[model samples]
Each structure stands twice: as structure tokens, then as C-alpha cells.
Target chain A: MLEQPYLDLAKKVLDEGHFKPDRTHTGTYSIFGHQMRFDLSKGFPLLTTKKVPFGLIKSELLWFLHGDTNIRFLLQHRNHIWDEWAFEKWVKSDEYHGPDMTDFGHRSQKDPEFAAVYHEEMAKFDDRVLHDDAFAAKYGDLGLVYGSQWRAWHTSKGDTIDQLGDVIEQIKTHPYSRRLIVSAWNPEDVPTMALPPCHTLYQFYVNDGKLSLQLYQRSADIFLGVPFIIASYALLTHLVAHECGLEVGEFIHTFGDAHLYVNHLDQIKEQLSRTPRPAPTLQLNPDKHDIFDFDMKDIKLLNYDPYPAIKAPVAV
Target chain B: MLEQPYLDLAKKVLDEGHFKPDRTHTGTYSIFGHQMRFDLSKGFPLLTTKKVPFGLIKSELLWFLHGDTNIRFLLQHRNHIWDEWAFEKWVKSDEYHGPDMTDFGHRSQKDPEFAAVYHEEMAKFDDRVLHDDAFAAKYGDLGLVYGSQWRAWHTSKGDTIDQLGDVIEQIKTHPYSRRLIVSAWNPEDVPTMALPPCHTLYQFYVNDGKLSLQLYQRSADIFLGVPFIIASYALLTHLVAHECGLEVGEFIHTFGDAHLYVNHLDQIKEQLSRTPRPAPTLQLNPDKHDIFDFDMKDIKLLNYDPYPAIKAPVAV
Candidate 1:
């Protein structure tokens, strides 16, 4: 029952959503302007219907909290979520002389021979990123990612504003202030970005000793990405509230184009058939006052029982 | 029934909203993460529950469309909504040698003696701004207002981005793009601003030859401000849909801190008890293809029969 909103959203989109073709040529059942609220005081909303990788969510969020854009931190925590984004930059650069790897992402998926070469090249790329400091600093760094946007927002005066830090300070001093917000949508850099922020902006609200957060995501992949996104923000709210000496209230996710890829419809339908169990509880180290100093061992997920992970094809 | 969602939001906030003190020291009944949808295909969403000034909305929206931040255009159109904001600038400047008007906004409201002086000074300021070109340019221009943020978003590269113009082009060329957005919350400007953007960011969506919009407003004054906000975005959706040669779909309004000031609670309750009337339809001149080129006479609301306007005190 805790995650019923998630299921209801999936059903609503399937029943009345529009058929729209997307960038990956994988058509989707899309709905605009949907909101889902998760009460974190009840339980952590990692999906009980299907398995969601909590470790990956933790590492990626902690990576963002630390304002880290480089993949080395994520890889050190054994997460490969951003490996391809970094590897693409390395291969596309003119410095390293390697076998022709143009269109390697799609090519490797289809051709077995090219896949072997791509795997070997990716292995080398990851190793170099881990071992060599200079190469990692040059290539592994993703300039202007969420970390950069949140912590070091570029200003016209050639200065950077730490939006998240200022918001935290405001929360402490002026808890009732309605301007507690951090935006990741920079119109200046959007044109040049390969993939702009999907979680465009988020705002925090403090009321009655409880803190709630709302995220405005411009695009959402309901089946594959939504569960992770829900949990990630929920965890962020929990951590921030923990530091602020407030109780966690809710995580409200609002979407612009919430879609289920045509390829993943059956997977979602299968997921819908499964009964949702009690949501698990998240455990953060009580000693951790600063979220920036949190390590992999500092966060834990307890009693997460769910149906087996469903296989779904990613659109891109 | 068409405007039922508006009434529902007011009732919901009244029934279950939190008590929180605001910037003006007038506490609020607040709720975070609320959404309401208006089916523009049915009728124009100007409230039939109460009379809303469509003329002011029209003038203000047109001024924003023209990318004019100076109060001269609004004043020329007989809209004085921004007069106070521009007047604040003039009175605070070194050149102004008028009566001691420190804390005039609140002080004048409570003290009738000061109110007279304030009104006289305000009238002089407005007359000067309207008549003197140099005075209007120097003091009447509110830099980084909605018009500036919407049209010419400042960039670190010593250039400005035309966000609204680019979004319209993208809407025409790539109708299904999820990145059809215009953001008014610029981080660089927020720290120094007297008032940050309340209507923070908005995104547009197209599906099945219908155009819909969703506005993520960070702070909503439900009693006095929301009726105007709803009509403003609804009109915006209509104008954009008209320009794109597409049918209007819906206007989804999502909020962060939607609140009714404690003083206005009785007013919202009064509005909620009224019987709803037939919704009005908007008329945009088909001959006028560009919204920026259109005048106030070009846009009209037809058959807007509503209950009489209700008076309530503004918090500030």
C-alpha cells in the first residue's frame, strides 16, 4: 500500500496515455503532468513489486551529494552507472589512437565481433581511469553534471554559487522560507549537453518539524528509471532531514512527460500483477551529521523483500 | 464542474493545510506538492466562482511576451500591478528626496497618515515613470524580472539566451521534444532579488496534435494569487497552442508551498461555498499569428459570467 501511487501511475498512463515516438525510436505510452507522493515516515519507497538496486542508488546519490562528477568515485564503490558516459568521452577524444569505435554503443549490442573489441577497450578505459590520475581527471570528469549544477552554478560574474549549500543554510536560519530550491536546468549549457537534466529542479518545504521535498522532473521512464528516481530522492530527503534535526515527511515527484517505452510495457504489466509488500526502512548512520562525509558503509537498507527483478530493454 | 479542482484545492488546504509563519509575519495554512489540471479544450479557466480581472492578466502577459521589463508598457496599458515594485526602487535611490518612506509598504497599510504621503509619492513616481523617458529607463526598469528571465536569460559567456523564442521554435520543429521549457528561477539573480520568482519554471508537452503545459510554481498564494496564476498560464497555453496551429489540451499546475494566508481563510471559504457557473471560452484573433505582435484588443474572454469579486487583504 505504501507504493500504491507508483502502481496507480503506471496503470493510469497505460489506460489513457498518448502514443508518442521518442528519440531512441522506441515509441512510448506517455502522459504529461503526473504527481506521486511517498511518505517516508511510513517506510522507504524502494519498490516492493520489483527489485530496485539500492546500492547503485546510494552510490550515485552520495556521488551527487559530494558534488562529484567523475566516475572514479562511483567505480570505486563498484557502480558502473556512468561508465559509458565517461568512456564515450575518452574514445571520442583525439589523443588516444585506438581501433575505430564510431557508433560503438549500438554496434556492440548487435555485432558479437565488435562487442568483443568494445569490451576490451572499455576494460582498458575503466582501468586507466582508476589507476592514472591525469587521465581520470581529464576524461572521467563530466563537466556541468548534476554535481556541478548543484554546487558550483556558473554566474555571469565568473563566480560559482553553491545552491545546495545556501539552501541548507537557509533551512537552518529561515526554515519557513518558501525559496528553498535548487535548479539543475541551466538554459546556457542545455544546448551543448548530450543529455540535459531530467530531474530539472527540486524544492524543499519545512512544516511542523517535518521536512518534505518535491522534484520537478521534465522526463520520466516509468518502468525502468522511476523506481530508482523515487528512492534516490527519498533518501536525499531523509539525509537532509536527518542533518536538519527534522523528521522525514514526504517525497513528491512531479513529471512532465512520464512514459513507458513500448519495449518495456510487458515488463511493467508483469510488475503490476505482483502484490506490493511492506516498504523497507532506510538506515543512515546517526553519527553522520555532514552528508558530504558519508561513505558507502554509512547507509543501509533493511528488510527489503520484493519480487524478482524483471528484465526490461532500455530505450537508449 | 469545470472549475471544481480550483475549489477542491482551496478546501483541501483549508481542511488539512499546515500552520506556518511567512515572510510578512501573517501566518499561512500551507500544503506542499499539490496539482490541479484545467482542460482548456472545455473552456477558458478564468474562475467562474469569482470575477477575475482578465484585462490585467492580458496586459501583463503581453508585456512579458514583448520582453519589456520597464513598467512604462504596463502603465501605458493601464495596469498598475507592478507599480509598487518599481516605486520601491525609486524611493530607495539616492536621487529620491521625497518624504521619509522607509518600510512604507507595511507602515502605510497600518498608518493612514503615512498612507497619504505614500500615496502622493507613489502617484508622483508613477507619473514621472509614465511621462519621463529617462526616469522610466533609470528607475522604472525592474532588471531580471519575469520578462528578462523568460526572454533574455543571462549567460556566463557574456551573452543572453532567448529561452522563450527558442522554446517556441522547438515546439514548431520538434513537437514531441520533452525539453520544451522556460525557467524564470535564475540562481545568480535570486540572492540579490527582493522577490524571487514564484512561478519558477514551466514545461510544454505535445501529443496527438494537442498542446498542454505544466507550470511548477515554487510558492503559491492560493487565495489572492492562484486565481490569477491559473488564468495566466491557461491563457499562455491558449496563445502558444494558437500559434503552433494545434488544439489546446490541458494546463496542469503543480505547487511546492500552496498556502492561504490566515487573514484570507474566510475569503477562500466564501469562494468554496459558491455554485459554479458556465466556463468562459477564450477568443484569440486568428489573423494574429505571433503573440508578441498582438495588442490587448486581440485577446478576449467570451461569456464570462461569474459571482462578484471578493475583497481580501494582501499579506504584504
Candidate 2:
């Protein structure tokens, strides 16, 4: 029951969450505050109740760790998690030269004809981003993304501060320091950003030769996003702890607007109905000490057994 | 029973917390992630287990609300909570002609002679800050404090952002926004800041006409600071909700490092032994809608009957 806290969160929200309208016009049953702790010592917290895409989580995290802002790297790994954001950027620009892709996310989900066309446009976009370096440089880069914010935080003095790198250094030197934090929520950029950082900030704590990380996510989509978030941060903790030469402790996820979309309620319930299996153990390439140097090959998940993957509509 | 979460946090940390060394060289019993929810509809959470100074909390909050980082305003209001930080600035400067005040925080605690001298110097400093406008402007202003970061976030483009004001506006216009956040953890300022913000970032949520606030405090001195922090954020929630024309819901306090200093173990135990009384109700001036415009006189705590104060040595 290493991942029971996640199940408990689902049950609690379903029973007691307040019904609230969200930005996507799909309302949600939401809770204001919740915290779930996963002890990395036992096993990796990839939910056993339902199958999670660990590969996408792996590629996405490595991309962030490498301080990469372009979807080219992600595309090379065959990950399409960020394709939508990059596609949106490309279609919004002056040189789009594609069909009118207005509100493609919602449109694609509703209309079959539009979905096919959208898929075609997306495929073209991805091919260009992967093949054409000049085109990718212009359209594929997501400036002020998680990686950019973590590694090259734009300073008022026109210089950049490497927040994540500094925190890692601090963890090495001043392990007891309470100020080991990296914030991704830039106030100047929040107003203009289409999708601001949902995992807004994170802090690291070291104690008794163990490293723990707590993530403060301002918004969480319980059914679709929470599983990926949990696995991502848990993996992040392991990598960081590995680099710092410390044992992995706990990955604590704290949320502000933790909600189950009205459309995804049935999916969550179905997921909750399944019995949880024993969690999988993570295997990291012990030879690689630096977290940034990690590639997809450097990580492995073993003995992951879960129920069939439950499908849910992403609320835009 | 409503404040049981606070008590539970104390008990849990005392029983299961990891003993770790801190920046002050004074050790602590610490837990990594913890959250306590205070329902404002029930009562205000000002720690009925111990008599908390509501005046200091009120004045300190008001000063921050005013976007005033100068301790002169605090001193004018007879709130000396920030005097130590301001005094440290003054004594460390070339302007100071005082006694050898190096390591005064620890030295004053250990030696009575030094404590008396520190107090004398602090009084003179406070007096000069109150009388001399220029001196107060230079030294009393603790730049990059919570007030500065919250109200005026420095941007990369030689401009400043009014984050708190903009968030309030967002609450009014889009009450369902998940991005109603004010961040005090500026990466640019953290490296050089003498004391970075512990209550790092906060987000607001609105559901069914009830507004709630969640504070992600990265570090907490559980014994001495937690009570004030709980009340402060609760009051802030109330004020913001009042301004947004919504009823107050809850104040969710989440922490990164919730620790009890080793020296304060007995004091926390004494507090734990005392039974919590019925929590007090908060009263804000019905005429006041703007949080920043309200003074200390506009806020009141009614029927806050609690046990006597148990003093503990602050860890520097």
C-alpha cells in the first residue's frame, strides 16, 4: 500500500470536494489543500491501481533536467506530451501556413474530421521540428518553460540564475540548510503564459543522510495529471539524491486546487475500484552521479503490475 | 477539536521527527512535509493552547500589507518583532559607532552582560529610526522582505510588478482562477538576502462563493513561529475574501520543514499537555473592503481566552 495515499486522495475528493467551475468550462469536484507523501525507500510510487506511462514521464523529466526548452529533444525520444504546447505556439505565429487550428485542443476531441486534420497538422509540425533545425529553433522552443525557469531564471540584472544547479550545490555543501528551494512561478510571466507551472515550486530537505523533496503544485488534475506528477517528482527526488550521494527519502506532493474534472469522475472511480498491486522498484545507473547527465537509458522501472489503463478526457 | 490539526502536527513531529542540525548550530526535531487546515467559518486559529500576542501579529501583517518594509512603521506601532533584523543592518554598517556587536544574536543569549548591551544598543537604534527619517529610510528598510517581494516583484525588464494587487484583481474578475498566487521566493534575491522568506508562496481558491488561501511555507519554527503564521495567513484569507465579496472558507498552511528546536522541546511539550479551548472569532471593519487600506484598529480578535505564555529561547 505504498501508493494508498493517492487512492485516499481520490476517495476524499470524490466524497467531500466542492463542485466548482474551471477555466475549460468543464466543472470539477475540487479540494483546496491536500498533501500526499511517498517514501522512496520502499518502492517507486508509480500507481499500481492503473497503468501509468513511465516512458513519457522519463523523457519529459530528462528534458527538464537537461535545461532544454525545445520540444526537439522530446520528439527525438518519441514523446508527444509537449507537442500540443509547441503546436499551439507554431499555429499562433505569423508563419503558420496551416489550416485554421483555432481552439484545436477542444475541437480535436469533439469533431472526428477536425481531429484527423489536427493530427495531420500535428504530424507535419513534429516532422519539421525534428528535421528542420532552423524551423525548430523558431517554433519548437517553449521559452520560460520548467527547464528554462529552473536552469536559467531571468534576473532583473540581465543575468540568469541557475536555481536547480545552485540547490544541488547547496545540498552538497550545506545539507542542513533550510533555504534549498527552486521556484518556477515567475510573477512577470504568469499573466502572459498559456500554461503556467502547475508544479509551482519545490524545496529540498536533507536529514540523516536522506534527501526529501516537497513540491507545491498550485493546480492538479487528479485523474490524468496526478499520476504523472507523482512519478515525475519521485524520479526527480531519486536522481537528485543520487547525485548528492544521499539515500532517497520521501516525495511529498502538496496541492492548491486538486480537482477531479466532471468528465473524468467515472474514470477516477473505475481506477479507485481496482485493487492496488505491489509498487515497482526503480533502478538507476549507479555510474552516473550527475542528475543532468541522465538519459532515458540511465533509468529503469521493474515489476510494475497494474490494472488496465483508464482513459480520461484532459480538461484543456 | 477544530485546532486538533495544529496539535496533531506538534505531536507527530515530537514523536516521529528526524533530529537534524540547523543553520544556527542549534539542532531541531524536524518533519519534511505537513499541512494544517483552519476553517475560518468555525473560528480563528490563534493557538488557544497558548496566549499569542495578537497585537504583534496584527501590526506586522498591517506593515506588510501597506507595502512598507521599513521597521519605523512597526516601531511607531510598538511592534518590535522586526527590530533585530533592522538592528543587524545598522550595526553591520560603517555608520555604526557602537560596541563590538559581532554574533550578537548568540552572544546576547549566552552572556547577560552582552544581552544588556544588545538591548541598550537596540533601544538607541529604535529611537534613532523613529526620529531620524533619513537614517530609518537607509537602515530600517529591510529590502527584499516579504512585503517587497509580495507587492513589488522585480522584473527582468527594469520594471516592478504588483503581484499582490494583480492577484486580488484576478480573484475579483476570475474567482475560479487556479493561478491566484503571490510569490515571495525570488531567485534573484535569495542568494544575497540575509534572511529569505520562510512563508515562500501562497495561492488562493474560490469555491461556491467561499474563498480559501493556502500558504506554502518552506521553513517553520514550529514552537514560536507557527502560531503567528497560522493566525497571519488566516487573517489574510479573511481579508482577501472580504475584499473579493466572498465568505471566508479555510486557511491551508503547508510546510516544507516543520521543526521544533531542541531548546524548545520542553516548551512544546508543555503546550501539548494543555487542552485547546474554543478558538476565537475574528472581526474586521465592515466598512473596509481594501486589505492594504486597513490599519491595526480595523482588525480585532474576540474571546481569545487561552493558557499563559510559555517562553522558549529562539534559535537565533
Candidate 3:
């Protein structure tokens, strides 16, 4: 039943939302100001309706936790979720003498021949990131991303503030304080970043020795992005609670513009029609007190039986 | 029925919230991740249970719209809501040779003798702000506030971005854009400011020619602040929709740490026990399409029937 909130949200947008064209030119059935509550006490919030790739979520989250902005660490884990951003940087460099890769993203998505060529370029880029340390250091870094803002927020005087570390300290010492907020929306850096933070900012609250977290995402793609978004924040809350010696309470996901892409409407409908099974359980190593030190082996999912994966194209 | 959401929120927090000590020494009954929706189509969201000062809200909002951070405009309008923040600056300045106003805020609130002294000092401060331009420019300006953050956000390269103006343009040209967000939570400035933005970021949404706004407030003082908060954002939604030539949809007020100070528990209870009367109707000048140019006389409230004010102690 905890998972039904996700499905119900998708259904609501399909039923009553207006059709709106997004920056990607892929139209969406969209609504605004949606909130959902997932009781972590019941089980983990991984969708029981459709198979979600837990491995990618784990590695991506671990990358953020380590404050590792380069693509090397992600490549080491065999996770390619962030390879495109790093590849984009590489293709725009003066040293890049390869075929013209500009607007390759949209063009490759539409044409098969261009797709193969783009894949070749992306493969070469990933190889360098994986093997060539010097090359990766130069072009693989995504500055001012979630990891940078969370761990090394830039200031006017040229110092960096570790916002996540600071908020963890606040939760440990002043659990009752209302200022337990970690913001990623830096006005100074938004104009320069490739994708300004979609998962904008979050706050933590503790009561009855249980910790709860709320994320204010400025935009949400209900079919392709919402499942991953929910799991990621929920995982973060679990880690934070564990580090603070508290039990998990709830994960409240609030959205500004929650939408269903027109391309993925059929996929979402098929996914929602299947009844949700019992939720899965997440396991984090109890031996590891510091969440920053967590790795692949330190986390696991149990009894995650679910329906087949529903295929849907992302809005880039 | 639209007004009942506020009452229900209060009742829920009173019943299920935990005791929490805030930055202000007064304790609070607090809960996190709460939302209340006010259909602006029903009427204005000014509370009909308590007589909210519409004049102060109007002047304060207009000052923000004008990108004026100085308290002189508020003082000129006979609005004392922002006098304390400006007075605090003057009291701490080297040029101030008047009475020792240290801890004047809490001291005055608790002690009647000190209240008189603080009131006298505040009156002098307000008078100087209204009459002395140089003094007001130096001391009365509460820098890094919502006004500056909204209209003139500073950048790393020393340039400024007009976020509110840009958002208005986006609403007018690209009504379906999910990126129509005006953010005040600048990570660079939050550490140095006295009070960081509680109403942090807001997004505009358009559906079927009706415009709605949702605000993500990081912290909220439910008893002392929520009524005014609701009125302010609702008014803003009205202004933005009018400028875009759209009908008013709804104002969604979302909160992070929505709380009632222990000092105001009785006040909230008393206020909630009384049944809410019919809501007041807000009237804005139809001739004024540009909200930034509107003055005090352009805005008015009609048939605002309400019970007498319930006095409560402010946390700071």
C-alpha cells in the first residue's frame, strides 16, 4: 500500500493534468504541487509495480556520498548514468579532434546511424575515464553538481561549506531545531551548470527517536524519474538515521511540477494496472557507523520480487 | 471549506507533533512536511477567524516587489512589522549612542518596563528611517533579504540576475514551463544572513489558462506566521496570474517545519474553537497589469468579517 501512492500520483496526472511542452520538446501531462508519504517502517520504497534498477541507484548515491564528481569512480563501479555529462565536456574540449559531437544527444536519439557513431564516441570517452587518470582529471569533472553542493558548497570568499556534513552534525546535536536544512540551489552557480538541481533541497526532522526527511524537487518526470527520485531520497534518510542512531520514520516526497511524458503514457498505464505486491526490504551494514564509508557490499535489497521492467524513454 | 484546511492542520499538529526546542528559546509543538491548499477561486486566503492586518501585508509585499530592502518604505506606510529588524541594526551600530538595546526584543516581550523602553527606541529608529535618507540607507536596509534575492540575485562573477522578473517573463511567454521558479535560498548568503529565507523557493504553474503557485518554506511559525504567509503568497499568485492574463487557480502552501510555539498553544486552541466565518474577498486594480508598479491604493479587501484578534507572544 505504501507503493500505491506512487501509482496513484501517476494516475492522477494522466487523468486530469493538462498537456504541456517541456524544454525537451517532449510534451507531458502535467500537474503541480503533489505530495506523497512513504512509511519506511513498513518496508523500503522501491516500486513493487515495476522492476527498478537498484544497482545504478546504489552506485550513484555512493558517488554523491563520497563527494566524487569525476566520472572515474562511477566508471569503476560500471555505472554509466553520468557518463553522458562527462562525455559532453570531453566533446567540447579543444583537444577533441573527433567527429563533430554537437547536438549528438537529440540527433542520436532519432537516427540509428548517428546513434552508432555517437555510441562509438561515448565508448571512447568512457574508456579514457576508466583508464587514463590524467584525461579523466581534465574533462571528467562535473563541477557544481549535487555532490559538490552537498559536500563543497562555494562561498563568496572562496571557501567551500560541506552542507551535508553540517546538517548531520545539527541532527546529532540539535535534533529539535528547525534549521536542519541542506540546500543545493546555489544562485551563483545555477546559470553555469548543465542541469541545475532537480532535487533542489531537503530538510530533516526528528521526533520520538525517528528521523524523517522531506525533499522539495522543483521538477518530476512521473514515469521515468519519480521512482528513482523516491528511492534515492529514501535511501539518504535511512543512512542519515542510521548515522544518528535513530529509527526510520517516513520519506515525504513533495514536487513542484509532477508530470507524465506523452511518450511514456502507455508504459505508465501498463505499470499501474498491475497490483502492487509486498514491498522490499533494504539492508545497510550495521557495522559501518559512518555513512560516508558505505560501499556496494555495505548495502543490499531483500525479497524484491516485482513485475517485469516497463520500458519508457527518458526526456533526456 | 477552503479555510478548513488551516484548522485541520493546526489540530493535527497539536495532536501528533512532538515537543521541540527552537533557536528562539521558546519551545514548540512541531511536525514536518505539511501542505495546505487554498483555492484562490473560492476567495482570498486571509483568515476569517482572526483579524489579520491587511495594510501591513500590502506595504511589505509592494516593497519586496519594488526590490526595496530598506525599512523606510514600510515605516512610511505606518507598518511596524519590520521595525525590529531595522532597529536591531541601529542599536548595534557604533553611531548609536542611545539606550542599550541589547536583547531588547525578548526582554521587551517578557518585561513591561523594558517594553516601554524598547518601544521608545523603536519609535526613534522608525522616525529616523522615515526622515533621514542617509541613516536609513546605512542602517535600515536589511540586506540579503527576500527582495534582493528575488529581484537582484548576486553571482559569482559579481553580476546580478533578476530572478523574479525573469520568472514573470517565463510565465507570460512560456506558460507551461516547469522552470518558472524564483528561489531565495542562496547557499552563499544563508550563512551570513540573520534570518535565511523561510519561504525559500516558489514555482509557477499554468493549466487551462489558470495560474497557480506553490511555495516551499523551510521553516514556519504556524501560529504567528502561517496566516500572514498564506495571505502573502496568495496575493502574489493573484498578481502573477493577472500579469499573465490568466485566471487564478489555487495557492498551495507547503511547509518543512510547521510549528506552534508553546507560548501560543492556548491562543491557537482558542482561535480554532471559534467557527470560521465566510472568507473575505480581495480586490486588485484591474488597470494595473504590472504588479511591480502597483501602490497601496490599488489593493483592497472587501467584507472581511472576523472575530477579535487573539494576542500571542512572538518567539523572537
- Candidate with top lDDT is 1
Per-residue lDDT of A280 in model 1:
92
- Which model, 1 or 2, shows the larger lDDT? 1
Q: If candidate 3 were superposed on the true structure by all CA atoms, what would the RMSD be?
A: 1.9
> Per-prediction interface RMSD?
0.8, 0.9, 1.6
lDDT of 2 by residue, A1-316 (tens): 8999999999999999988888888988989899999889999999989889999999999999989999999999899998888888888888778699898888888999999999998999999999999999988998889999999998766788899999999999999989999999888899999889999999999998999999999899888889999999999999998888899999999999999999998888888778888899999998888889888899999999888888877887
- How much is the TM-score of the A chain of model 2? 0.98
The clash count for each model shown is: 0, 0, 0
Interface quality of candidate 3 as DockQ: 0.66
lDDT of each residue in B200-250, candidate 1, tens digit only: 999999989999999999999898899999988999898988899999999
lDDT of 2 by residue, B225-303 (tens): 8989998899989888888889998889999999998999998888888998888889999998888999988998899
What candidate 3 gets wrong by more than 4 Å, as runs, is A100-102
Give per-residue CA lDDT, model 3, range A111-158, as digits (tens): 898899999888888998778889988888877777888999887677
Model 1 CAPRI quality: high
Over all chains combined, what TM-score does candidate 2 have?
A: 0.98
Q: List the residue pairs that clash in candidate 3.
A: none
Of 2 and 3, the candidate ahead on lDDT is 2
Better of 2 and 3 by DockQ: 2
